[PDB]
Design an enzyme around this catalytic site. Structure first.
Site, mmCIF file in Angstrom:
data_model
loop_
_atom_site.group_PDB
_atom_site.id
_atom_site.type_symbol
_atom_site.label_atom_id
_atom_site.label_comp_id
_atom_site.label_asym_id
_atom_site.label_seq_id
_atom_site.Cartn_x
_atom_site.Cartn_y
_atom_site.Cartn_z
ATOM 1 N N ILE A 79 -6.476 -8.042 0.376
ATOM 2 C CA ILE A 79 -4.888 -7.965 0.188
ATOM 3 C C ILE A 79 -4.763 -6.968 -0.785
ATOM 4 O O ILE A 79 -5.172 -6.995 -1.809
ATOM 5 C CB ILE A 79 -4.461 -9.126 0.220
ATOM 6 C CG1 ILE A 79 -4.801 -10.245 1.061
ATOM 7 C CG2 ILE A 79 -3.100 -8.942 -0.133
ATOM 8 C CD1 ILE A 79 -4.339 -11.676 0.535
ATOM 9 N N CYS A 80 -4.052 -5.726 -0.477
ATOM 10 C CA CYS A 80 -3.553 -4.595 -1.392
ATOM 11 C C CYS A 80 -2.388 -5.091 -1.935
ATOM 12 O O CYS A 80 -1.373 -4.916 -1.245
ATOM 13 C CB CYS A 80 -3.625 -3.360 -0.859
ATOM 14 S SG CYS A 80 -3.271 -2.037 -2.167
ATOM 15 N N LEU A 81 -2.355 -5.929 -2.988
ATOM 16 C CA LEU A 81 -1.071 -6.392 -3.791
ATOM 17 C C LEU A 81 -1.599 -6.002 -5.353
ATOM 18 O O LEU A 81 -2.347 -6.494 -5.686
ATOM 19 C CB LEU A 81 -1.083 -7.695 -3.535
ATOM 20 C CG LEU A 81 -0.069 -8.659 -4.088
ATOM 21 C CD1 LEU A 81 1.459 -7.940 -3.556
ATOM 22 C CD2 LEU A 81 0.130 -9.715 -3.659
ATOM 23 N N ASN A 89 -1.524 -3.276 4.813
ATOM 24 C CA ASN A 89 -2.141 -3.782 3.411
ATOM 25 C C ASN A 89 -3.104 -4.807 3.541
ATOM 26 O O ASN A 89 -3.622 -5.164 2.408
ATOM 27 C CB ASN A 89 -1.075 -4.207 2.502
ATOM 28 C CG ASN A 89 0.199 -3.124 2.366
ATOM 29 O OD1 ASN A 89 1.261 -3.546 2.838
ATOM 30 N ND2 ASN A 89 -0.083 -1.856 2.060
#
Length: 154
Positions: free
Chosen positions: A91-93, A84
């Site tokens: 950042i894949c959040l 991620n």
């Protein structure tokens, strides 16, 4: 300048700076790089027990002028092997993308990043090869992640 005229985003960021000074998230610190309240750095120690243990990771954090109504921009500056987090430190959040709320804080974002380090999300990856390896060969994923932590984060 008369401080009675501080912007609402500057006042909110200052309050979050006090908060994070008195009660930082575990294994984290963050605050302004210097004299600009909108431009922060964070240090995260890799969570103990994880593949990142022993690593020291640096993040850049930028608040927008309409904070808290848009999320901060948070990127890793240290390379990290994680499905991620891409090679540009993105950042894949979800709370940093389309699920931000003004009740969230930089402390909650850093708590969420630490949780993501310990428990990644391989069904919504930014680095597909790493997500696949996590799923099909977790032991080799973890070897790689510990190798990168030693090589790039120590």
């Amino acid at each position: 300048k008369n401080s009675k005229l501080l912007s609402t985003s500057a006042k909110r960021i200052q309050k979050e700076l006090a908060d994070i000074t008195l009660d930082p998230p575990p294994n984290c610190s963050a605050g302004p790089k210097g004299d600009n309240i909108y431009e922060w750095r964070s240090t995260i120690l890799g969570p103990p027990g994880s593949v990142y243990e022993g690593g020291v990771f640096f993040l850049d954090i930028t608040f927008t002028p309409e904070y808290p109504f848009k999320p901060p921009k948070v990127t890793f500056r240290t390379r990290i092997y994680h499905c991620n987090i891409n090679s540009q430190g993105v950042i894949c959040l979800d709370i940093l993308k389309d699920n931000w709320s003004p009740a969230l804080t930089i402390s909650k974002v850093l708590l969420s990043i630490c949780s993501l380090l310990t428990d990644c999300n391989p069904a919504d990856p930014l680095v597909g090869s790493i997500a696949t390896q996590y799923m099909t060969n977790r032991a080799e994923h973890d070897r790689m992640a510990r190798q990168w932590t030693k090589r790039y984060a120590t």
